[PDB]
Amino acid sequence: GNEFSSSGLGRAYSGEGAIADDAGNVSRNPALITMFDRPTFSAGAVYIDPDVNISGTSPSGRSLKADNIAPTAWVPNMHFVAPINDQFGWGASITSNYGLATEFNDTYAGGSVGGTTDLETMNLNLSGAYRLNNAWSFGLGFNAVYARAKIERFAGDLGQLVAGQIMQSPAGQTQQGQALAATANGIDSNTKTAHLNGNQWGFGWNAGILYELDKNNRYALTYRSEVKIDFLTLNLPEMWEVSGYNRVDPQWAIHYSLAYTSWSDAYRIALGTTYYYDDNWTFRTGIAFDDSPVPAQNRSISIPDQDRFWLSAGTTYAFNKDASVDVGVSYMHGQSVKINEGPYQFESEGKAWLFGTNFNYAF
Numbered sequence: 486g487n488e489f490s491s492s493g494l495g496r497a498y499s500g501e502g503a504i505a506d507d508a509g510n511v512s513r514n515p516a517l518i519t520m521f522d523r524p525t526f527s528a529g530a531v532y533i534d535p536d537v538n539i540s541g542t543s544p545s546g547r548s549l550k551a552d553n554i555a556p557t558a559w560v561p562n563m564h565f566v567a568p569i570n571d572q573f574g575w576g577a578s579i580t581s582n583y584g585l586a587t588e589f590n591d592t593y594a595g596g597s598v599g600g601t602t603d604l605e606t607m608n609l610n611l612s613g614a615y616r617l618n619n620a621w622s623f624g625l626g627f628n629a630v631y632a633r634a635k636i637e638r639f640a641g642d643l644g645q646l647v648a649g650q651i652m653q654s655p656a657g658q659t660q661q662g663q664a665l666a667a668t669a670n671g672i673d674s675n676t677k678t679a680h681l682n683g684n685q686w687g688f689g690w691n692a693g694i695l696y697e698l699d700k701n702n703r704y705a706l707t708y709r710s711e712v713k714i715d716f717l718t719l720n721l722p723e724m725w726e727v728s729g730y731n732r733v734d735p736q737w738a739i740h741y742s743l744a745y746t747s748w749s750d751a752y753r754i755a756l757g758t759t760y761y762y763d764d765n766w767t768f769r770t771g772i773a774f775d776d777s778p779v780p781a782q783n784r785s786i787s788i789p790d791q792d793r794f795w796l797s798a799g800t801t802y803a804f805n806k807d808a809s810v811d812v813g814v815s816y817m818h819g820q821s822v823k824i825n826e827g828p829y830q831f832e833s834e835g836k837a838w839l840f841g842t843n844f845n846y847a848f
Contacts, residue, residue: 486755487513487580487581488560488562488581488839488841489512489562489578490507490509490510490512490527490562490564490811490813490841490843491529491531491799491812491813492506492769492801492811492813492843493509493813494531494799494813494815494839494841495771495798495799495800495812495813495814495815496757496758496759496771497755497756497757497772497773497797497815498755498773499728499755499756499757499772499773500728500729500740500741500742500755500757501513501514501726501740502514502517502693502695502705502726503695503728503729503730503740504728504730507527507564507811507843507845508521508527508565508566509527509562509564509843511566511576511578511614512562512576512578512580512610513707513726514624514705515576515612515613515614515623515624515691515692515693516623516624516694516705516707517566517614517693517695518566518568518574518576518624519574519614519615519616519622519624519695520695521566521567521568521574522568523847524565524566524568524847524848525565525845525846525847525848526564526565526566526845526846526847526848527845527846528562528843528844529842530559530561530562530842530843531559531560531562531840532557532558532560532839533557533559533560533837533838533839534838534839534840535555535556535789535835535836536553536555536836536838537554537555537587537789537833537835538552538553538834539551539554539831539832539833540831540832541829541832543595543642544646544828544829545594545642545645547594547645547674548594549593549595551590551599551786554587554588554589554599555586555789555837556586556587556588558584558586562578562579562580562581562843563577563578563579563580564576564578565578567848569613571616572615572616572617573616574613574616575611575614576612576613576626577609577610577612578610579608579609580607581605581606581607582608582630582709582721583604583721584606585602585603585604585788586602586603587599587601587602587787588601588603589601591639591674592675593639593641593674594642594829595641595786595826595829595831596638596639596640596641596674597638597640597643597678598638598785598786598827598829599638600637600638600639600679601635601636602636602637603633603634603635604633604634604635604719605632605634606630606631606632606633606721607630607632608629609628610629610691611626612624612625612627620697620698621694621695621696622693622694622695622696622697623692623693623695624692624693624695625690625692626690626691626692627689628688628690628710628712629687629688630686630687630688630689630714630721631684631686631687632687633684634682634684634716635682636679636680636681636682637680638679639674639675639676639677639679640672640674640678641674642674643669643672644669644671644672645669645674648666648667652666681716681717683716685714685716686714687712687713687714687715687721689709689710689711689721690710691707691708691709691710692707692708693705693707693708694707700732701731702729702731702732704727705727705728705729706725706726706727707725708723708724708725709723709725710723722747722749722778723746724744724745725744725745725746726742726743726745727742727743727744728740728741728742729741729742735761736760738758738759738760738761739758740756741756742754742756743755744775748778750778751776751777752775752776753773753775753776754773754775755771755774755775755795756771756773757771757797765802766800768798768801769798769799769800769801770799771795771799771815772795772796772797773794773797774793774794775792775795776792777791779791782825784822784824784826784833785824786824786831786833789835791819791820791822792820792822793817793818793819794817794818794819795816795817796815796816796817797813797815797839798815799811799812799814799815800812803845807846808846808847809844809845810842810845811841811843811845813840813841813842814838814839814840814841815838815839816836816838816839817836817838817839818836818837819834819835819836820834822834
């Protein structure tokens, strides 16, 4: 599930890669290109409104509350698919496969692990798909990712711990130590202690292997590579996804995906259903989960990621066999978990609401 389409949001991004009803999906499964007759164009974006709230106490008395540390964000998509002839087709899309941003105040007791953390990514993908049989089709594409990162950490209340520490050791009474005692408590809870900002482009491929028992049933195996971004170096994780779509009735369908990302450790489970009311109206709903990459001990307050549920419901309105708009609503709720970072002990619990719109035009 990755903000690449309003349609997607609507079905908890379940099945994508095995469902082609809008240029949207080639982005996720090259091979789907071969499922479009005319050349299709889809555009739009999604608006995420998180609600990450940190709570807890420092071993320095200073509080560790950080209400609403996650900022809203807009995520746009550009989707173009067009058939070259009868066995070859190409397509391109501008999408944001990944994006993270949490932000604390200058004076956070624990700003040693929580200044500001913005990391924006943009994906430029150009690709072609091949068809070799009413059933088998293979797609392959190339990606250029633009990564913008900002990292800020402050002294929080370290000096206050370094202090109270020295004011416990035999070097305590000592006034030759008193300096060390304070002078640490002296350090201002906002003294920038980490500033590394920069931009750079990453590259990588991704392939598809759609197979379809017929006009109403298909399964795919997609693969998204690894992307090394050299600033320090950043790594976007490999993503092996398996999905299936079935049109059980003239008016009903079923789509499911089981994704597996390997951050040099996690998977995503989704299932949703579509319902084609008539020529004009369509309605979709999707449920989904996705175990968290982070292993118990190494969690982080700066990276609000943990086992979470997706609950989605969306609707598409086709103007006239050529144009259509989709509306996407998804509500993400990740249960609460305590983090044990640096010398502090926090508790994280944040939800989020997604709203997205896309327009669909075919030639």
